Amino acid sequence: SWPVCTRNGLPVCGETCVGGTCNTPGCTC
Incomplete structure (x- = not known):
């Protein structure tokens, strides 16, 4: 999100x- x-x-x-990105495979943004 x-x-x-x-x-x-x-x-x-x-x-x-x-920034527009996450570093946790499993969660979305």
Whole structure:
């Protein structure tokens, strides 16, 4: 989701992706 790593809509990774990317295979942005 632009600034956070979610699990199909739910920020549940704890990391962010402001740049536009996450580094946690399993979460989306």
